[PDB]
Symmetry: D2
Subunit: 236 residues, 4 copies
């Protein structure tokens, strides 16, 4: 079998194999709310990571791991629009929420620069793209591949369906250094896709930590960032 493999059909409150950072928590209905869901609605940032670090590449052998993750999430806005987005990410083992972060940086970045020191690769599901506060984002809700910077290296228009459940399948094929995000809404057949080339060895350290993150930088334009299920498998 492969190096690592784990499935979560549902989450349980205060799960021991998940590290909660920020407002991230799991409701009694079994859903992981990376973003605080409360009345009244409050400004929030949260991240949830699998407790054990993953060896993503080996310095001794030069081998890079190929992984695949599948998960289902929901983003429900009270209004027609919402903020700020959700993100699946790989960061250095036991990464802490960068000091002075913000909802628009999904708790992954301290600023809008492209510093190789960040050592972060993430797939963002950006719901907010306004240029007043997010000048880097394009003119629409998007799915983006982020490498060491919140300014995605490649994006694609996200046909977001308010309150609808999305099935995401992300694959990473080490041999060809390609990353493929595969999103689809089973309710109405709406689906989006994006692929990009990335060399993990050249960006992340050997041992990383995987998980999700998100934010809400304005309680006025509230929306949830609930992940329902999560499958992950990696292999060197």
């Amino acid at each position: 079998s492969d190096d690592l493999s784990f499935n979560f059909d549902k989450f349980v409150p205060n799960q021991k194999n998940i590290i909660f950072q920020g407002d991230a928590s799991v409701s009694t209905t079994g859903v992981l709310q990376v973003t605080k869901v409360s009345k009244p609605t409050t400004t929030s940032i949260g991240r949830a990571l699998y407790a054990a670090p993953i060896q993503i590449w080996d310095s001794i052998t030069g081998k890079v791991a190929s992984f695949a993750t599948s998960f289902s999430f929901v983003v429900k806005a009270d209004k027609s629009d919402g903020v700020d987005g959700l993100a699946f990410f790989l960061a250095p083992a036991n990464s802490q929420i960068p000091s002075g972060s913000s909802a628009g940086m999904f708790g992954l970045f301290s600023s809008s620069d492209s510093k190789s020191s960040n050592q972060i690769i993430a797939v963002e599901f950006d719901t907010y793209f306004g240029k007043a506060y997010n000048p880097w984002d394009p003119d629409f809700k998007h799915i983006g591949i982020d490498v060491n910077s919140i300014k995605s290296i490649k994006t694609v228009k996200w046909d977001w369906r308010n309150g609808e459940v999305a099935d995401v399948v992300i694959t990473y094929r080490a041999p060809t250094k390609s990353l493929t995000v595969c999103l689809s809404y089973p309710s109405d057949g709406t689906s989006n896709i994006i692929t990009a080339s990335v060399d993990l060895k050249a960006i992340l350290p050997e041992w990383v930590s995987v998980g999700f993150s998100g934010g809400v930088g304005n309680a006025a334009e509230f929306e949830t960032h609930d992940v329902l299920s999560w499958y992950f498998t990696s292999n060197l």
Copy 2:
């Protein structure tokens, strides 16, 4: 673990766990050529299926299986255009090539009707769409979900890259009856996607056979239909 799961990193000549029908064969370089690759180029039809049938649904319990398959293929044309296409499919256990078939029907259909008797669900990678011989096809190279008929129930434009390797990931989520085709070319980031609702129970019998098929209805506009690797997992 799941009911069934098999991986083929490469194929071997005259593989014992694969049923070859038509011109389907595997070259000494380890690639499954569902379509005959010869000099001079000849009209051809072929299908390759995994030897053991799969229980796709249970009449006793009403449960429907959820499956996922991943594979990589190449379609190389001598000219700029080619024929006829490739297809991944589920057919009744040990299905034979329908009598009087043709390249445009990928060896899966006897005619252009929508007969529930065909009991075939397939994902086509149609390279030929000319209305003179394929009146059902749209005005472009496409990826299509076929249900009991060669006239796809839903299609999407296929941004085919001649000679380039494509990575396909198809998923079937029984609970939501949705099928998602996820194609991408690692070489240039080009990717396509399609989702559709289908109830396997309502179309195929309990025991099916899975595999690939394709054809070339005109030696003049030759192209290969080579599948390089195949991963398959099913579960009730």
Copy 3:
């Protein structure tokens, strides 16, 4: 993931991915009776194999596969003693029941010789050891590793529990060429174990077929040979 992997929690009547030979069949309660269970009791021989052949070793690369199988069975005798036994085995792809076989040879051997041509490796659960008809067997009910001959190369006393369910775990570690049979009765903690060195490459052809077999050479001393569940995984 690995080359092959399949799980059967229960069997269904006339399962399509299992090849039935002899009196082998599956009752409506979901159990695979390799031996005929009828009133009145009749002399019988049966074998059940997984439909697809398995590549156990590669001539091109010299690599040998490591496999592991787990299953649960029951052997119920009307009297205190019973015949003839059960066997898990690896034989050439799509092997037929040897002409002129007998219950004591579990439908795997034509005679009592050690012919390398048999190309059979099997784990027997011998219930009958009488020297009048089975001169090769030791003085007790045994578990035996059979290589090209019904005269086991190594045996161990089997503490058979009439009607009780046995959990067997067999492992094959290619690197060290060792085979380990691990049997245990959850009801009363009774357990037996045996290990032996065997080189698959030196005995079986590249493509084999796996399954079970058994017999009853005397309806007077009847017993069942029912296998309840089966897990199998192989990898090159």
Copy 4:
């Protein structure tokens, strides 16, 4: 797939997904030495656990997980005899080495009582059985199932082979509450086995931590406690 599954073909020095307690460490040759290997030989105690906790049972649903673990170890003594032993165990999530422990208690127990508070289930590979310091142990080197107490609830004679590699397969079948230890030495076919009934729900809390432990209570009778590989899979 199952809830959790991880394979370690070899260990790397200062592995990030393993928690080292005591003298436990991993040499540059890639082997996990739970016991300190130094010149001169020194008194030692160590434990290594997988970083993420495992949900072994669910209070919400009453379901108990079934697990299986496979590993290979070596115990090499300079003399003909050695101390003290090795142990595979399940303890409360992130358990610390009990205060005032000793080599004979493999770093799992504070005393020789049977306190349900210990919440520990372990499989011991006891090399030392002298009654002067280990009055609970039987008159031979043994494999034992320990439940909340170092006084095994069931043991079996261990035919230890000095310096030889042992392949262990432990299985836990929740439905029948049975635990089966399956040990074998591929070098000379020597093998041992033990089964016992245990209800995890009645002993451990929902979230446990798994790993190995061992000790050496006398530098004079030194031996290694090296684990070479580890496979683990659990499922609710």
